[PDB]
Amino acid sequence: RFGRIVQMHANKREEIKEVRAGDIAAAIGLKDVTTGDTLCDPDAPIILERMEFPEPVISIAVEPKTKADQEKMGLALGRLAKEDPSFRVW
Amino acid sequence: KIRTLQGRVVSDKMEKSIVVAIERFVKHPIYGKFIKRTTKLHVHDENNECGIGDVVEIRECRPLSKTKSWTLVRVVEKAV
Amino acid sequence: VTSYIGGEGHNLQEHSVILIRGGRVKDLPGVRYHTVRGALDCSGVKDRKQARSKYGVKRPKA
Amino acid sequence: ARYLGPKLKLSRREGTDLFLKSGVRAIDTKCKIEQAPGQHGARKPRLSDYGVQLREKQKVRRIYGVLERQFRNYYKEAARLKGNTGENLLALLEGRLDNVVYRMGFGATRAEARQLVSHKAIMVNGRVVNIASYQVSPNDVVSIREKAKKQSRVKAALELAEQREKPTWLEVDAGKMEGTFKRKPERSDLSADINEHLIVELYSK
Amino acid sequence: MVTIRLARHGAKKRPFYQVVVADSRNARNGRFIERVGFFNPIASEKEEGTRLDLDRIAHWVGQGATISDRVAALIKEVNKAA
Amino acid sequence: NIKSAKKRAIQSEKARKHNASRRSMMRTFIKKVYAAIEAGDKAAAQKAFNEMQPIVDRQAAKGLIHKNKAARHKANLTAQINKLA
RNA sequence: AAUUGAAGAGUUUGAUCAUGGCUCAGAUUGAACGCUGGCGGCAGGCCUAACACAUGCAAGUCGAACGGUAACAGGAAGAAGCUUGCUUCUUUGCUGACGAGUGGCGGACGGGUGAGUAAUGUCUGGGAAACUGCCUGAUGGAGGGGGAUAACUACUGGAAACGGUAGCUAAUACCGCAUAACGUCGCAAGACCAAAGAGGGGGACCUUCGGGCCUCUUGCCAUCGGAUGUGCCCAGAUGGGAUUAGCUAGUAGGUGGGGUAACGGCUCACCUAGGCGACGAUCCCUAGCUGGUCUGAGAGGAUGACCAGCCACACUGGAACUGAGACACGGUCCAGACUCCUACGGGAGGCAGCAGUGGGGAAUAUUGCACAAUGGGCGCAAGCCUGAUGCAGCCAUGCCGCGUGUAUGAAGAAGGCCUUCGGGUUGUAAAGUACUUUCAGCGGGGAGGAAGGGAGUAAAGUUAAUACCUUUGCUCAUUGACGUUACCCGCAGAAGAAGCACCGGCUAACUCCGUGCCAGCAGCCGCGGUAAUACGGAGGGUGCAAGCGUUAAUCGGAAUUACUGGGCGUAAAGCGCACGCAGGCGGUUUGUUAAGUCAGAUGUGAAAUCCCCGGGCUCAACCUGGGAACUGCAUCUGAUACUGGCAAG
């Protein structure tokens, strides 16, 4: 789906009801989308434009103040796992 | 006729008013034994007529006071 | 409270978010609950092909 | 959820034949019936009263493959109606579609019969029905779809079932399969080896 | 303003209505004054599809009721001569 | 919120401004009557009661005061004067 | 035709009978969890923190009230390109429509939640001292005038929100005045009170060229009633604790003024010194109540989710306005806490509305689609809006239906598991043979849920008029969110689809190996100390099934709270004994009353739910017709045994 569309003036929300070609907008919702995804029109010819995935470099570690936050530790960093391409979790 | 009770005069230490007691021989719900279930009503009447211990016909009427909402019809069985 | 650790070979420790279901462990005085294996940080039993709905062992692949 | 297993093993757990694998070999003999349901079924138990109630409940179950959840509904239905619950239980169970398919001889085994019913090839009373637990209501008729008729399963059912006892409360056309069902199934018109008070005693508690 | 409207009963995709006299402010399937008849829109071929209590609907007219749209149309569908 | 029926706020403010003035117009006329009953002079009490009666019944037509309240305020005044003189 | 309905077992002892608890066999769930998991139908889906909430939507409409028109499209005198009527444009509220505002109606309904609330409430059955927009019936009127004020204008304040100042025009806005009655007040005579105009068509008279005039449509205001809803009073019922004994001071009642839609300590003044309480007052804790759901043979016990009636609350606390109705969810004002915008001056808001989020938790969903049908608001209507509702999505959570094949098939296979090792078992179970092929996958057909409404036309009304409007048939073109719908028809193929628990006794179902009071099992009793059917692993077998067990939960069994239906000498239990108030019960006879009691009638006992004979989805769950039922309660008329009250013996 496409839930809501926003023009995003530096993390400010104004509502867009229709998007044209060549404009930047934010689509709200979109459960399974990743970086550089080629969103195309279904029931129509399907296109592709994506070819790049950059490098990771330095891997460190962490351990929280207690074990009661470990479920949030995998969740909140998992919340950060969806965001950045060059940021992995082991 | 109309809805009228029998009662018994209890507290007549006041003016133009009476608290009557009416007996209800109800059946207990679970144990089947009849209990003398009392019921006390602030009942309005006319100018100070009777004393304690006399059966008194009383009917429902307007809420004449905060609590008094019944009217004494007549006094039966004057005793000592 | 206390609780019993069913099966054998548990990887439990000083702090572990676990799950608890009630049940008398009669031979043990004053222990009234059972840790349900198949839950959180108390993992499944090292291979047990019989009665695996309790102890939370999955079905072997085939 | 149907039965889908080795077939005559239930008959050796019940000793007698419940006509579950009739087919071409109309003699049972290649079954070693009665004394071998398993590795230790070559003996006999003291067989408690609970067991003799259950094993009798299993036999009336296994002829028609009724699962317990479906089976218990009949006991709720039989005791709901008038008459005797021992009589009502089998009577409403005789009205099952595959039961009337078998009683009219359209199927030689109930598994062979239900394969015809579930694949909607039977036009009972003017409407094709694919659900075998359909109550075949009294004083009615049952036809077979002509556009899927006689594909060597129907004729073998026509052959063998006309050697087997020729049932009573209904008429078979026997030429082109036009079954007619007339009256209420009576307790005297039964296989009679089954008991009834074994079941309704077990279902009280 | 007491009206004579429809209240929807039944399951999904297989509706049913019973035409009821109710106080118009209240909900559809909720508090009503009196049920007077019913109506089936998927009334498979049996003659019973509507049994409208005509005399009380004629009686509620004198009491100032507002007969709704399809309720009036069903009276025009099930005529006053049959 | 910013619903466009919020004019009912300011439609009520001009309404209350109309009311409280005319509501006090009634009450002040009752004060003049009541002052005459504390005074006791009959003709002043009668004429004031004969003055505000068209004022009391008129606002009943505008519905600011219920008819029975307006009927009560007639029955209030004439009972007080008759027992006086 | 409408209750054809009630089981027990294990466990103390060396053994027995009892008393007696503990436990299991059954059903049920708003369930979670473990393992597994094919499809369809009807359902249900925040039980915990009324915890705090980002974002979009959840209530507008009216031009047939009105000045106007900022947009959009127009006939329109004209403008200019210049293909001289082809067009660029200027006029212009004169048309259909229409923001911004005034005004009318709604927003107090629907939708949500159960914190508070033990009685201000709720269920039941009654009453009298009332009010009630819209809808409706009847009886009449519907005369005549006025001053402002938005909007908008000229200036100006601000970042916005929102203004402030001076002029200005209309209204179905507001304010008098006339004139009143079956109206209000008053013993009476009398006094006093209302209203508004808009929309369609047009013969003819009159046209200041608008209009007036006529008809029709509708609205308007007064009074008495209907209907519906609402406020209010009274009797009973409505939880646990006495380790909660006195409680209350506008408190109990009178009188008078005021208040109240109407009644009343409702609110004050003065007086009287009372009122409630062992049939449990006051106090503390917990809780929304009911129809009903679950279980039970019944009586009862537990419970009050979903659906429906009622009540209370709307961030916390308090108050009032407006109006028919609110002390108001998406209103106002103030105080407090918490967030948001900012130009720092000042403002803004309340998810316990639908989704949705963090959080709490074992535990619960999509920021979805359409206003097509039903219902509601406004409107002449067309229509607009509608997170109500209808539908779709996810989730076996539940109930119900269905499939993963059928038949044949013995060398009794191979292999595995056993064997007193001769055989047996797995097991006709597989292979192979011949057929069927639902649902899924795929391609084509195909209902109904749709009644209406729109334009035209004929007819009857209708009026001075064949006009208008109204009703009635009638024709044409149309209205389907869901939805590649329900269903149907054909293609390819057995092919895409079976697990989970238990197997000592209770309880249906056993051997072998490993292991040795260890590892562990377990609801109860209890097993394991080297031959374990109880432990774990195989094989075999049983149960149930797209579910199956585990835990939690309630009743059952439990006649272990015994009303139906238990006991007290020794098993738990006679106060150490006695006197005695309340209270419970009470010999015998007549008369009387009918309270209890019983018989009949009446009103009601909302619908649904539950039960019976039926009907419709292919069956079923499920939706649905009538009936029965709701065993109650209240009133009325009788009967006079029994119990009670009274009178006499």
Swiss-Prot record, chain A:
Signal peptide: none annotated. Catalyzes the GTP-dependent ribosomal translocation step during translation elongation. During this step, the ribosome changes from the pre-translocational (PRE) to the post-translocational (POST) state as the newly formed A-site-bound peptidyl-tRNA and P-site-bound deacylated tRNA move to the P and E sites, respectively. Catalyzes the coordinated movement of the two tRNA molecules, the mRNA and conformational changes in the ribosome. Disulfide bonds: none annotated. The lineage of its organism: Bacteria, Pseudomonadati, Pseudomonadota, Gammaproteobacteria, Enterobacterales. The gene is fusA. It is found in: Cytoplasm. This is Elongation factor G. Belongs to the TRAFAC class translation factor GTPase superfamily. Classic translation factor GTPase family. EF-G/EF-2 subfamily. It comes from Escherichia coli (strain K12).
Swiss-Prot record, chain B:
It comes from the Bacteria. The keyword Transferase does not apply. GO terms for biological process: cytoplasmic translation; response to antibiotic; ribosomal small subunit assembly. Keywords: Antibiotic resistance, Ribonucleoprotein, Ribosomal protein, RNA-binding, rRNA-binding. The strain missing both S17 and L29 grows very slowly and has a rather unstable temperature-sensitive phenotype. This is Small ribosomal subunit protein uS17. InterPro entries: NA-bd_OB-fold, Ribosomal_uS17, Ribosomal_uS17_bact/chlr, Ribosomal_uS17_CS. GO terms for molecular function: rRNA binding; small ribosomal subunit rRNA binding; structural constituent of ribosome; zinc ion binding. The keyword Isomerase does not apply. Part of the 30S ribosomal subunit. One of its GO terms (cellular component) is cytoplasm. Belongs to the universal ribosomal protein uS17 family. One of the primary rRNA binding proteins, it binds specifically to the 5'-end of 16S ribosomal RNA. Also plays a role in translational accuracy; neamine-resistant ribosomes show reduced neamine-induced misreading in vitro.
UniProtKB/Swiss-Prot annotation, chain E:
The keyword Secreted does not apply. PROSITE patterns: RIBOSOMAL_S16. Keywords: Endonuclease, Hydrolase, Nuclease, Ribonucleoprotein, Ribosomal protein. GO terms for molecular function: DNA endonuclease activity; four-way junction DNA binding; structural constituent of ribosome. InterPro entries: Ribosomal_bS16 (IPR000307), Ribosomal_bS16_CS (IPR020592), Ribosomal_bS16_dom_sf (IPR023803). The keyword GTP-binding does not apply. Pfam families: Ribosomal_S16 (PF00886). Induction: Part of the rpsP-rimM-trmD-rplS operon. GO terms for cellular component: cytoplasm; cytosolic small ribosomal subunit; small ribosomal subunit. One of its GO terms (biological process) is cytoplasmic translation. PANTHER family: 30S RIBOSOMAL PROTEIN S16 (PTHR12919), SMALL RIBOSOMAL SUBUNIT PROTEIN BS16M (PTHR12919:SF20). Part of the 30S ribosomal subunit. Belongs to the bacterial ribosomal protein bS16 family. In addition to being a ribosomal protein, S16 also has a cation-dependent endonuclease activity. In-frame fusions with the ribosome maturation factor rimM suppress mutations in the latter (probably due to increased rimM expression) and are found in translationally active 70S ribosomes. This is Small ribosomal subunit protein bS16. It comes from Escherichia coli (strain K12).
UniProtKB/Swiss-Prot annotation, chain F:
The keyword Hydrolase does not apply. InterPro entries: Ribosomal_bS20, Ribosomal_bS20_sf. One of its GO terms (biological process) is cytoplasmic translation. Part of the 30S ribosomal subunit. Binds directly to 16S ribosomal RNA. Belongs to the bacterial ribosomal protein bS20 family. NCBIfam families: S20 (TIGR00029). This is Small ribosomal subunit protein bS20. It comes from Escherichia coli (strain K12). The lineage of its organism: Bacteria, Pseudomonadati, Pseudomonadota, Gammaproteobacteria, Enterobacterales.
